Ligand binder design. Structure first.
Ligand SMILES: [Cl-]
Length: 129
């Protein structure tokens, strides 16, 4: 599923991401835009052989099991395919664990490079929330 900007904002808010660990909703929408272009089915392979999955590009090296990343962990306790669902619940629940691990949203490279320090409120502008 390819979300609309405001559609995704409302889904994330309903799932408890607004101001989660101090990160306003606009940060999460911005991250999703540049990680996946709002596409729940996005996948990308990394150099080390791990793969990033879903709307927030969660890495199989640490967070999910895809059966093909030897010596990796599965900290969210889920198959990586669950992160590709049109229902964003699994992605959000796993993102909450990631952002709580000490490094905040800096875990997301596109957030650090393209959202951090910008006017992220612009990403939820005009939305009915
Ligand atoms: Cl933080």
């Amino acid at each position: 599923k390819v979300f609309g900007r405001c559609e995704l904002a409302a889904a994330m808010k309903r799932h408890g991401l607004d101001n989660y660990r101090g990160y306003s909703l606009g940060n999460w929408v911005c991250a999703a835009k540049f990680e996946s272009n709002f596409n729940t089915q996005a996948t990308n392979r990394n150099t080390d052989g791990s793969t990033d999955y879903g709307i927030l590009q969660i890495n199989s090296r640490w967070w999910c099991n895809d059966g093909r990343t030897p010596g990796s962990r599965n900290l969210c306790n889920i198959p990586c395919s669950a992160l590709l669902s049109s229902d964003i619940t699994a992605s959000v629940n796993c993102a909450k664990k990631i952002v709580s691990d000490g490094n905040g949203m800096n875990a997301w490279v596109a957030w650090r490079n393209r959202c951090k320090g910008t006017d992220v409120q612009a990403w939820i502008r005009g939305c009915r929330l």
